[PDB]
Structures are given as structure tokens and as C-alpha cells.
Amino acid sequence: KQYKDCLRLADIVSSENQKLYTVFSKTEMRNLLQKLRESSLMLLDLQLDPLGYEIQS
Amino acid sequence: ESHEAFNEWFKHINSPPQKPTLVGQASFTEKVAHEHKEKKYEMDFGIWKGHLDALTS
Amino acid sequence: TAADVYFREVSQMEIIFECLVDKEEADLESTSIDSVEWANIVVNVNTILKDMLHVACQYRQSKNSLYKNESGIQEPEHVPWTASSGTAGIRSVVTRQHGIILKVYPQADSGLRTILIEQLAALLNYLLDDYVTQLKSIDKLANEERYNILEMEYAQKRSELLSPLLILGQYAWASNLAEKYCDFDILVQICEMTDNQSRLQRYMTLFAEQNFSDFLFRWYLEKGKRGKLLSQPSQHGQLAAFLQAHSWLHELNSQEFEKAHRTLQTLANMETRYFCK
Amino acid sequence: SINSTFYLLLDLITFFDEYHAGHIDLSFDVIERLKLVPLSQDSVEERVAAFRNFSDEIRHNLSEILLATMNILFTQYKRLKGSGPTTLGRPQRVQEDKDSVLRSQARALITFAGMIPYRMSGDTNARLVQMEVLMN
User: Fold this and answer.
1) CA–CA separation, C260 vs C277, rounded Å?
2) Cα–Cα distance between B53 and B41 in angstroms, integer?
3) Is A31 on the interface with D (CB under 8 A)?
């Protein structure tokens, strides 16, 4: 249930320091984005924003 | 090392403590034995969860 | 004691055969489940005030005008017009009807079949009151509209008080009440949402003009109220609730990645409070 | 005991023959009939209890059986996703239901592999989880 840390994987994969985005296939990148969307939906069920910040009322 | 840690974590997450179930016509001795099983389960679940969070880290 | 003068004024013998059901009710001893015969006499009055309102309605189906309700005239009587009596909404006749509805206090303590017959009865009565307010509102001309739109809010806050009363009652009658004041969507739409019948909210949008432009705007107004995935309990239906919403989180979920990118960038630009974010 | 082990090893040879021949649906029907592994979450505890009664000859083969069964599920899932939308006439709901079932079966196999009192190779568990992550 560390759904906020699931979304930080996008920042790590997109990082120019390690260029991890170059080693992913188009199918794996689609599957990663689907898995990140699934974690983002679970944050909304917890009444957080899609990125795991408190929804400022 | 990352694959070993993941396999240890994956073994541990798939072995949760079993919640005691009360059979619907339990004797007075079986109800006291159930309360002792439920207190044991809460303790065993607390230990299992603490170990899971350490392995997750 | 007499009747010829209580016919020119029979309207008074309905506000008082209610005050004599209440002073009979004080001695009904219907404190809990003990009283039975005494919850049968409160229903015997409810049946007579009801079929008396049935008689005023069918005598307004037997018109003579060849423009006002053509059926029953020289045209086929196989289809009656609006079952309203064209009553003008009396402020003592209406008050005794909204009094005997709140004798829904008996259905709290009563045998199962009995609570349904008085419920079908109080439904049968309210579907004459909402019909006479509809007939009177139709007759209003365009000028003096401020009085016409205030009489609408008054009927709409009473179809809205006839609804919480039937939110505990059977929703097999909700389909009828919704068709009787033939809109009153906010009740039927929340009845279709408390249950597992979105076959009903599909059947509701099927038989309605521009149901699609309404159902989406009804979903957005009901943000967190109706159209949730998470309020309903297994497969596609849970997914559907997310789709209804029209941000980046429900956009990743809906597979709307291009849309999620636009909002994620917009949030990144307004961000000043936290560098890490 | 010995006789039941022998016929179960013969049926497992037939399972691996159909699997290696690429007859994915026939190999699935065989493993479902053998009731060696759970194909539903509800069957996991029953199959973990049954595992204690298997002979060592069957227990030694369980890692390969789980990998072959997970590869069957993963390939059926790929066939379901790779069937592009060009058959005008199959109801979209039946496809979503079948995807949900294959993911539930895959989860049951991993839950089972984690609950068994038998130390599988670390590579076996890694491949099982990797195939599930590719199905999610």
C-alpha cells in the first residue's frame, strides 16, 4: 500500500542520470503506465490526489 | 541480492497467519480456546506485519 | 345530522374526519405491536378519503369540452387524459393530506401485508395532490412568472418530502411515483443508485429525451454522491464509475493518457510550495 | 500410495508432452483434471493441505509444473490481448471477464507457491512473479 512510492518509479524511469527509459520495450512501458494508473486509482480511494498529496479542500 | 530479498519478501507475504474461525456450536471450553486462539492470532499477525514491513524496506 | 348544506361544504367533513381519526388515535393505544383493531380503523378512513379523491378525478375525465380532454367526448375514451381533478390546491384540503401521510407512524408497528395496503393507499392519494399542482402550474401565463417559479419550488420541495417518506418504503412504488409527477428524477435516480439496478437507470435514460446529456451532468453534480465505482460493489461496473467522471488519477484509470499529461503539466506549473513535488 | 504416484507421473508426462507440443488448451485441461495446483483463490488452502500427502517424486516436479502452468496462463492471456478488435461480433464483456479469471488463476498459483512448506528455487519464484507482473 505504498502507492505514492509506486508513482515515484515514473521519475526514476524517466531520469536522465540512468536513462532507464531506453531499455524498456514499447509493451513494457505501456504495462508500467497501466500499473502506475492502478496505484493512482488506489490513492483516489484513500481520498488523496492522483499523486498521493492531500486534496486541499 | 535484490532478487533474494524479493524472494524472501514474496515467501513471507504469501504466508499470513490464519484468522481463527469459530464453529457454530462450540462448547464453553471451545469458546475459551477460541479467545486464546484469537489473542494468539493478533500477536502472530503483529509480528508477521512488522517482519513484512522490514523485508519491504 | 344533515347533508344538503355539508355538500356545498363537504370539504370541511374531511378536515374533521381526520381530527376524529386522531382523537380516535389517542385512544388507539398503538404504543407498540399490541394494538391491531385500532390500526384497522385508521386505514378504513384512509380508504374512504382516498376513493373520494378517486371520484373527483373520474368526474374530471367525464368532461364535455371538445378541446379540454377530447377523450370521453366525440373522441375515443379508451385513453383518459391527466388523472388530476384540476383542483386548485386548497390550504386545508392539502394540509389534511400531508397530515395523514405522517400517519406513516403506523407502518413502524404493523403486520407486513397491512403496511403495504396503506402504502399503496398513501401513494394513490399523493398522486392526486401532485396532479392538481401540475394542472394548476400548466395554466400559468408568462407574465407574473416570479409567482409561477416560486409555486414550482414549493411543489418540488414536496415531491422532495414525499420522497424521503418513500425512501424507507417499497421502491416498487417509486417507479410509479416518478412517472406520476412524470419527471421527479432526483428520487428515482437515487433509488436506482442505492440498489444494484443500473438496468433501471439505463431504462430511465432509455425512455427520456436527451438522457445522455442529462446523465453525465447528473453524474458531475453528484460528485462523490452517485456514479462512484467504490460505493457500488466486482467487474466492469466498478470501472464504469471512473469513466463517468469528466484529475490525472481518474484519467490514468480511464486510459486517457494524453489528458493526464496535460493536467500533470498544468499542476507542475502552478507548483511553488514544494520543489520535490 | 505407490500406484497413485506412478499414474500421476504418467499423467504429468502427458501434460508436459502437450505443453512442449504447444497444445496450450489441452495441457490446461490436463492440469485442471489433475487438481495438483489451485486454479482459484478459494482452492489454495485445500491444495496446500493436499501437498503434504504427495510423494517426494511429485514434490520434486512441482516447480516445473507451476512454471509450465503459469506459462500456459500467460500465453492464453497474450492470445486474448493479441486478438485485435477485428472480429465484429464477440461481446466485449466476455473478454474482460476472461482476463479477470486468468489474472485470478495466476494470483492463486503465486499464493500457493508462497504457502507450500517446500523451498522452491529462487529463479522459479522470480519467474512466477515476473509473469504475473506482465499479466497486470
Assistant:
1) 16
2) 18
3) yes
